[PDB]
């Protein structure tokens, strides 16, 4: 057990494996309320499932951190919380729907 | 107090400069008759909130177009 994450305000996590299993599982549940063909669901389930499989396949925290490449394991937990928060916001936003409106003809033309 | 409330309403209006006392009547319209502006009416109401010491919201204030209607509103 490390004594500090080295980042001010980021407390050390006593049980990182259990915390990540809970978070990644929560994410796959929220993603189930998104349409099956939405790219956000397919892509997020893919990366979430890869991380969850890494967590189960590696009991040593320092070796798990190397596998995930997300910095400290406490950083990886925080990113999982961010993804879970994002997944819930996407359900209300529904960004997989068609483009709301095309721009005017020369909107993105440069130089004029 | 209906007389008491009404007498004060007229007292303020005469104090207001842009109204001729002789033209003034308890049934005159601020616009159609007295020939006042929208912002003139708003100033009058603000004087009403001062004499009677309570707040008159804009939704209600836009209906008070004659001295009599002010009496009716203050009754409540």
């Amino acid at each position: 057990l490390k004594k500090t994450t080295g980042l001010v305000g980021l407390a050390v996590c006593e049980t990182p494996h259990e915390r990540l299993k809970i978070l990644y599982t929560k994410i796959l549940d929220v993603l189930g309320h998104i349409p099956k063909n939405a790219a956000y669901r397919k892509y997020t389930e893919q990366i979430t499932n890869e991380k969850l499989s890494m967590v189960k396949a590696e009991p040593d925290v320092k070796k798990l951190e190397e596998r995930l490449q997300g910095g400290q394991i406490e950083e990886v937990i925080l990113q999982a919380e961010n993804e879970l928060s994002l997944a819930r916001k996407m359900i209300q936003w529904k960004p997989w729907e068609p483009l709301v409106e095309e721009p005017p003809a020369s909107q993105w033309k440069w130089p004029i | 107090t209906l007389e008491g409330i009404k007498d004060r309403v007229l007292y303020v209006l005469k104090l207001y400069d842009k109204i001729d006392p002789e033209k003034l009547s308890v049934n005159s319209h601020f616009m159609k008759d007295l020939g006042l502006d929208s912002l003139d009416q708003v100033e009058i109401i603000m004087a009403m909130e001062d004499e009677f010491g309570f707040e008159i919201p804009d939704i209600d204030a836009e209906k008070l177009m004659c001295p009599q209607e002010i009496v009716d509103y203050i009754a409540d």
């Binding site: - | 929208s38 912002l39 708003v42 100033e43 603000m46 804009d58 939704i59 204030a61 836009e62």
Partner: protein, 114 residues
Amino acid sequence: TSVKPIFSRDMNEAKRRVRELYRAWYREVPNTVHLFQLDISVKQGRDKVREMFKKNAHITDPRVVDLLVIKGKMELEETIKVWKQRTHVMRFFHETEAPRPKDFLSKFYVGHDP
């Protein structure tokens, strides 16, 4: 002709915010004249407030009216909070500007401008 609104969805809604702003300005002038120790009368200050409102009386676009109210409230906040100094308040009155000529003959005598 279908646009995003700012605050008001029509002129009646916008005209309410104008009246609320006018009342706020009307009641603030007496404290402004005292706090800034201005030499103008309270009537002058209110006469100036009314003049500022009246030059915008011809607007019929609720979005434009909304921005005028938005800007008018910023100006009020600057005044009530004494972020403005005395110079900023008195800039509305153009005391050092001499009266420009308005009729054709006067403008003709002094220069070339229309």
